[PDB]
Amino acid sequence: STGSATTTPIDSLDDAYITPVQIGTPAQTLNLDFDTGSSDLWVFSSETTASEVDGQTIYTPSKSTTAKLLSGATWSISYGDGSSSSGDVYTDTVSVGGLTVTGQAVESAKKVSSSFTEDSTIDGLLGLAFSTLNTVSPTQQKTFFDNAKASLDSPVFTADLGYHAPGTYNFGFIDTTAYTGSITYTAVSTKQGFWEWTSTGYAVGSGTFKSTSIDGIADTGTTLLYLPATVVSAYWAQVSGAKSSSSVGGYVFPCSATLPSFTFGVGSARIVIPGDYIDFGPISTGSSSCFGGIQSSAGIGINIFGDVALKAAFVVFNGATTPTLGFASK
Template identity: 50%
Template sequence: MDKLQPLLRPACYDDGKRPSFAAAYARAARRYGFEPGRNAGFAKRNNVVVKVKSHADKDTAHEVPAESIQNGALEYVVPVKIGTPGVTLNLDFDTGSSDLWVWSSEFAKASRYSGHTIYNPAKSSTAKKASGTWNISYGDGSSASGNVYTDTVTVGDVKIPGQSVELAEKLSSSFLQDGGNDGLLGLAWPSINTVSPKPVATPVENMISKSIIDPPVFTVKLGRGTEPGFYSFGYIDTSVTSNPITYTDVDNSQGFWQVPSTSWSLGGETKTREGNTTILDTGTTLLLVSDDVVDELYGAIPGAKYDNEQGGYTFPTDAAVPDVEFAVGDTLYKVNMKDIAFGDAGDGRSFGGIQSRGDLDFDIFGDIFLKSVYVVFNQGEKKVGLAQRDD
């Protein structure tokens, strides 16, 4: 099968403007609902996302507006055609969820919001109404819900007939103010699909069960800044890097791409993290790890400090940053220096792209980590393969 390389929009940038650190961190807190550890700048409390205002007194906090969490183009989007003759929507490809939902004509107010392409099943000769409803809720109370159709979905040169498509009838304010995408395509395991009374097959599950792709894999190379990236389905592009792809078994019991990560390295010194695991999540921007790792990392960067106002660690932009590596399985992968400095924090300082996971008992390897590797998600064999990228 020919490789598929649709261009992606850079994460956390808005047409070249500086990335939104607060939005990236708050989005992760909302997504996983973690409470703060020593260094978590945001947390979910009482069903809202809050910013920790004082590092010493974490009971002092104020709410982060729900609509700000999605602002700033916090995702990569990929063009996907739905229907016959079809309309092309820009969808957020997300390995941390399992729903394919879109802005649709079922949402009565859709025309009031510019910047979105709308899917209308009445204009597709292959659309069919299906049973079931769906409802996605987030920690701050934002949500999206609606009904279900089946239609032909085309991603690059991969065509999936009879794919379930979840049509938004209701969208809360955070989605309405996110002009970056026309919906979401979930790439996690089918068990966490939200369609009720019975979950529906995800696009990748259908690609595999209908023998549309072989091998049963999808891969991702995330671009940096304006650099193009791509997803591929049923094809492994060995030209991405000269380094070998190393495979690790996946624990999908929670529906995520969860793998062991029992060591890390700082400045060439490897350190053990017994029993630690991580989730590979293209829907999270930052790299989130335990407080002890965060403290040791920034303790090795001259001038680094936890910034109460910013809600995370910052460091001098011209500081010498030691090499940082994190393991997936038995292999360490280096995080590109360009990405450890996530964005401009003002006064000659940069936001750290590696921050606290709060009270979670697993790490989240988001785009800050994933941009340094080429990843093969082997859904057929429950494995992931990673190769260090040359750039």
């Protein structure tokens, strides 16, 4: 089997991407944030505290003839941005782009933090990291990809995120029309539960490539590119007027600037992020100070190849017995 679904930016900045997902019988379609940095499929629901729902579409398990309470199971998750959610668990039928899993754990939110409530466009998350990170207790549950893997034509999914445009998540096949050149594969460590790999270095604009190992994670659920302070300083030093602002929470730059590109290494191959992809617009409405799309990871504990980086590439998440990651230009 295979599946193919379009993923769409939630706003004009590409702050995140939503993909429609069919849950239950008859189908209830929710727009979920596919997140290769976590491993829980959770949704706004008829059980979510009413004051914490503001425009989202909800899953109502009582209206699904295939829903079943997973007795005793609870979940609770906290994300790197300080947001969180928690609740109980049903199993139900879940379909993405024509690919159907029966018995998928659907984590029903009883509580969500303010940032989820405040984002009316995201109805929940669909985790695509390794199932060892799933938070369901006392019986950990499998991701959608883990459950579908055996049925797929090939045990892979691909992320093709658009810049200010829709893109595609495919399951079970590699669309050879969706990228240019060849796909360069690189090793993955699953020891932390992430799609964790080592970039071979970077360049800023037309500058020379610096060969240096950068361990980080491929994370479709993080907006920006978070890299070591040395790398980020070298990038922003090429932008007149750019500075790190403690009050804003990262590097800012004059909105009148033209930003240089940023290149990262994948083995001997190179992925070029155009400068425009690094512009996240005014820090507040009407400001001439703009927020940078490359930020320091020094306070995180891990480097994060988020959407800024991934949307410059066609990315293969290879879930073979030994997982690997593939990157191609497009």
